[PDB]
Amino acid sequence: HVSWRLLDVVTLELGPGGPRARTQRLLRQLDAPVFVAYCSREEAEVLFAEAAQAGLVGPGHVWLVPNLALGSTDAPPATFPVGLISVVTESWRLSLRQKVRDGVAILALGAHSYWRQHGTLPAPAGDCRVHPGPVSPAREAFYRHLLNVTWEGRDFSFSPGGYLVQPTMVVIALNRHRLWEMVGRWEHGVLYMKYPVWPRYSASLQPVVDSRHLTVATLEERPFVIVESPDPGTGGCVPNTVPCRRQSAPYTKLCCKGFCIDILKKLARVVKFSYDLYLVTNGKHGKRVRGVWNGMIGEVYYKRADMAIGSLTINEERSEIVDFSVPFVETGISVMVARVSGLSDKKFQRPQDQYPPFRFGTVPNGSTERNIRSNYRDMHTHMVKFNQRSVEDALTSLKMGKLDAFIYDAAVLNYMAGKDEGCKLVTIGSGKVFATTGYGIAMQKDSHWKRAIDLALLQFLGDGETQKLETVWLSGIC
């Protein structure tokens, strides 16, 4: 499916005795972060000892071996660097009694399916000494009927070759305490994993977090970010999308696409850094309830992540603790109405006349909510009876007539009127923008990443592709 750049191929003599120098000098003349090797147990021992001798067993490299190696599966040999990866079939940890019962069940179910077809057990052909027998159709039919079984929560479908197909196996690896443990399953052509990242180990038990692999957080919102379930077309989702996990130990693999995802993907190549993306659990953007900050801001303040991409408005309260980059889009507070002359209009300024009882927006837990509460007490008090379910329910209610006006962010409402049933509009337009600000990228305080990403994003904005992304993802009909 993918390019799969291949470095080189090497074969070497791995005999029990001989002059090592020719292989030893050659082996050290290599450079690759991932190795795959296929050999026998003694060959595994000798090659692994030689590699450990000539410095290729540190925390930087990874080894892959097939099932032909690893021998006992119950006795851990020495000289094995922690982190070896291999694949073995199921029921490895089971008992011999379980296995023999499984075989008995297989043959018994074969016979059970058989007697219905012919009425009795197949004739037992056996003769050590005599050795007769050309091709016999009855036993051939028995062998045919034996090939497909079921039940006992598994499957055994044999090919013409003497091996089962559609198998179920498990990925195995060497834990930090020199012990085998499960890593990943494989059922019906889709793959899973115990961890979202590969740990890698130092000399001691303490792992090295190392550089790069920045942790980045976001949450579902307007088309800046969109969450889509994988499609069965390829047992996943196509490129132009990045896998994203909904944190909460088990996880289901989603993949997220949108505007911020695109800008992050474009940014990643130039500065050459690694990243893993995961959703927020508590949600609802950001707030401060007695210093208990939830959402992305909470995640980045308690040193649980490195960046928080997505919808976020720079204001005074948030900027005190967390550093920000330059803005990239314009935004602010706007007003939405069905198809008033500013905030200071008497309708919103003097809620005392009972004949035009208006209504508002004010999705709770919102960035603008803090501003409107801090600046106008009367509006905040009179905004209690306001629709609050989503950026979706408000549109429906307005199209119904259960409310009169709507207030929220600008860059999302002005788009929301872009493609709608009919043409619902707003007031004068961008000329009515209050507390104009922009979206930005949050980052942990005092990091070189802040300056690097800021300068890179300024260069990108000066390039001019932002207009292309905007016209790709932010265009409407009306």
Partner: peptide
């Protein structure tokens, strides 16, 4: 009012 290369009606799909 349709543009073959890229149009709002066709780039973004709907029930119509």
């Amino acid at each position: 009012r349709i543009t073959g290369i890229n149009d709002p009606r066709l780039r973004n799909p709907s029930d119509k």
